[PDB]
Design an enzyme around this catalytic site. Sequence first.
Site, PDB file in Angstrom:
ATOM      1  N   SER A 149     -27.643 128.024   3.465  1.00  0.00           N
ATOM      2  CA  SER A 149     -28.755 127.747   4.384  1.00  0.00           C
ATOM      3  C   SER A 149     -29.947 128.668   4.122  1.00  0.00           C
ATOM      4  O   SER A 149     -30.446 128.702   2.995  1.00  0.00           O
ATOM      5  CB  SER A 149     -28.272 127.850   5.826  1.00  0.00           C
ATOM      6  N   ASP A 196     -29.018 116.414   4.314  1.00  0.00           N
ATOM      7  CA  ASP A 196     -28.706 117.683   4.961  1.00  0.00           C
ATOM      8  C   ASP A 196     -29.089 117.641   6.442  1.00  0.00           C
ATOM      9  O   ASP A 196     -30.181 117.189   6.794  1.00  0.00           O
ATOM     10  CB  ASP A 196     -29.438 118.806   4.221  1.00  0.00           C
ATOM     11  N   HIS A 245     -23.848 120.194   6.483  1.00  0.00           N
ATOM     12  CA  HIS A 245     -24.669 121.394   6.309  1.00  0.00           C
ATOM     13  C   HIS A 245     -23.770 122.562   5.913  1.00  0.00           C
ATOM     14  O   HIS A 245     -22.782 122.824   6.596  1.00  0.00           O
ATOM     15  CB  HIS A 245     -25.445 121.732   7.599  1.00  0.00           C
TER      16      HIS A 245
END
Length: 341
Positions: free
Chosen positions: A145, A243, A287
């Site tokens: 991330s 995503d 994610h």
Amino acid sequence: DLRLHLLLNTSVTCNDGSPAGYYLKESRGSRRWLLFLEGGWYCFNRENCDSRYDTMRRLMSSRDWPRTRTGTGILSSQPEENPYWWNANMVFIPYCSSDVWSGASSKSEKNEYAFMGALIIQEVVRELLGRGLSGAKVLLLAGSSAGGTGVLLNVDRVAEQLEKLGYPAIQVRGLADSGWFLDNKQYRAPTEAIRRGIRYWNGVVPERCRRQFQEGEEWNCFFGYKVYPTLRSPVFVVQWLFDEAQLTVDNVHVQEGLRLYIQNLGRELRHTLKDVPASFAPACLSHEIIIRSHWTDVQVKGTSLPRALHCWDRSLHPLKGCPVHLVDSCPWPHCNPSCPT
Ligand SMILES: Cc1ccc(CN(C)Cc2ccccc2)o1
Ligand SMILES: *[C@@H]1O[C@H](CO)[C@@H](O)[C@H](O)[C@H]1NC(C)=O
């Protein structure tokens, strides 16, 4: 487990001035080092950083960190959970700077918060050289991330740091997971928030990318498809085609208009990866993946992510039966049957 070490240089701090740090599990029979960057969005002014300090304080402070952490996924030391690098030296660097690992600003009479993400990475590397990193063959800088974007912003500076310190034999590489975003039109913004953040953090970007976009336009270097062509270190890119964080910033939560939007997003992301030779991009709504315990489960064209990473290692010594570029072509989330449930 990995054991916590707070930085000996206590002037390199989390947002609230507490010392930053790292979790370490050594593997004395190995010359490979994995340094993982945690994610967790960011904050870009006094008011929204104050909110984050109230209810997301572990991402702004070391005061409440535990003494140990269990390694999971690519940080696991069990071959069953981690077929790729189970015998490596393992490092988890907590994200407590709220700046996508770009900041270089101390707390002061004029700054309520410190934003030192870029300096935290530098200091961890320096202190690890005294603990065994000086003998390394490969240093893999990985992240998920915001930490995946942090890899892109910092891998070449780590390579330069080690060269200037006199360790030209250590090969620095990057693994960016779920940090490759598009500055696209929303369905109903990241660029303005990042533009404000860089000024608030005194944020820094890689030199060659900075020189292309120039003063005032450094925000461009936070977007994978713009910064990646400027990088010299080898970087493997892991990115879900749909995503969940990308869809959040696009204001997406199915009629013809939304169907076409979602299919166009998948096609645009595929296009940006066409000339990325080491990559893994499945057609799933999800994610992050690389420190999830079941990261071994998803496959593209019959090849798992741990296998692709092992093939990448071999390529840095095409390979028969050992691919490194793996991008799904089907156009809708979960058209790959191996997607996370
Ligand atoms: C759970 C999590 C942490 C970070 C993110 C991604 N999020 C879109 C932040 C970001 C990262 C890089 C560039 C711009 C924005 O999700
Ligand atoms: C501690 O870190 C700061 C900021 O990176 C640096 O200016 C200072 O020289 C460091 N101290 C030592 C003793 O290395």
